[PDB]
From Swiss-Prot:
Upper taxonomic lineage: Eukaryota, Viridiplantae, Streptophyta, Embryophyta, Tracheophyta
Keywords: Chloroplast, Copper, Electron transport, Membrane, Metal-binding, Plastid, Thylakoid, Transit peptide, Transport
Protein name: Plastocyanin B, chloroplastic
Species this protein is from: Populus nigra
Binding residues annotated for Cu cation, in chain numbering: 37, 84, 87, 92
Shown part of the complete sequence: 70 to 168 of 168
Protein task: Participates in electron transfer between P700 and the cytochrome b6-f complex in photosystem I.
Domain Plastocyanin-like: 1-99
Location (main, coarse): plastid
Record keyword Ligase present: no
Family: Belongs to the plastocyanin family.
Superkingdom classification of source: Eukaryota
Transmembrane parts of this sequence: none
Keyword Chloroplast found: yes
Bound cofactor: record note: The crystal structure with reduced Cu(1+) has also been determined.
Compartment(s) where it occurs, according to its Swiss-Prot or TrEMBL record: Plastid, Chloroplast thylakoid membrane
């Protein structure tokens, strides 16, 4: 499933910013507008047993061009919060439910 980084109107949002996926389904974050963006998962808001380092970009890695992707597949069921490191303070955060 595809999640856009930035809305077409320049909003600092994941599109969609909440969704559910079955365990192990590929999630493709696709750079859209309003760069730079990246994608990390919050170590304080993922299921027990999840290592966010395996499913997160480096803070230093920034997506600066339209169409770049970051793909992950989440095996453990439960709720995950992801965020954009440059824009976390601007509310660029989302939630995926793995079921
Ligand atoms: Cu962002």
């Amino acid at each position: 499933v595809d999640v856009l980084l930035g809305a077409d109107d320049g909003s600092l949002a994941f599109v969609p910013s909440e969704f559910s996926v079955p365990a192990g389904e590929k999630i493709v974050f696709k750079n859209n507008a309003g760069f730079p963006h990246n994608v990390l998962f919050d170590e304080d808001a993922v299921p027990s047993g999840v290592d966010v380092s395996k499913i997160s970009m480096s803070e230093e890695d920034l997506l600066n061009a339209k169409g770049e992707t970051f793909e992950v597949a989440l095996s453990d069921k439960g709720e995950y919060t992801f965020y954009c490191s440059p824009h976390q303070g601007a509310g660029m955060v989302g939630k995926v439910i793995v079921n």
